[PDB]
């Protein structure tokens, strides 16, 4: 009577924990729902996977959640929130390590 349910695990979750050096483009965490939200220098794919937009150190923090005003469901949740209440979410940041570049003497004209 019970059919299906044979699907294997997605192997989703965090691929880079805090303090891990991460290169640009590396996937930090794969998730089905928004468990960890994108922080600074972290981009989201179509499937909600978080990838490092810069080369640096991954840091997980708790930050206030301010959704986009056009996110109707979240805006409604906020509108129903009592005064003084602030939503918090777990954000993943990539603290860039190297500088954008250096100025080098190329020609002594």
């Amino acid at each position: 009577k019970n059919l299906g349910g044979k699907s294997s695990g997605r192997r989703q979750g965090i691929k880079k924990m805090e303090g891990h050096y991460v290169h640009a483009g590396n996937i930090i965490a794969t998730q089905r729902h928004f468990r960890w939200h994108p922080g600074a220098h972290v981009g989201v794919g179509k499937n909600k996977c978080l990838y490092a937009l810069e080369e640096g150190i991954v840091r997980y923090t708790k930050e206030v959640y301010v959704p986009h005003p056009r996110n109707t469901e979240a805006v409604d949740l906020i509108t129903r929130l009592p005064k003084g209440a602030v939503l918090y979410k777990t954000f993943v940041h990539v603290v860039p390590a190297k500088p954008e570049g250096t100025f080098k003497l190329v020609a002594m004209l």
């Binding site: 922080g39 600074a40 840091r59 997980y60 923090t61 708790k62 930050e63 206030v64 959640y65 301010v66 005003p69 805006v75 906020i78 509108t79 929130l81 009592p82 005064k83 003084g84 209440a85 602030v86 939503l87 954000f91 940041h93």
Partner: peptide
């Protein structure tokens, strides 16, 4: 909060306020 504006004001104030957990 009947307004996203007031919610945002409170959230920004809270973010500016110091916290004991790791923050941005």
């Amino acid at each position: 909060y009947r307004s996203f504006d007031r919610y945002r004001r409170r959230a920004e104030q809270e973010a500016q306020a110091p916290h004991w957990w790791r923050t941005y």
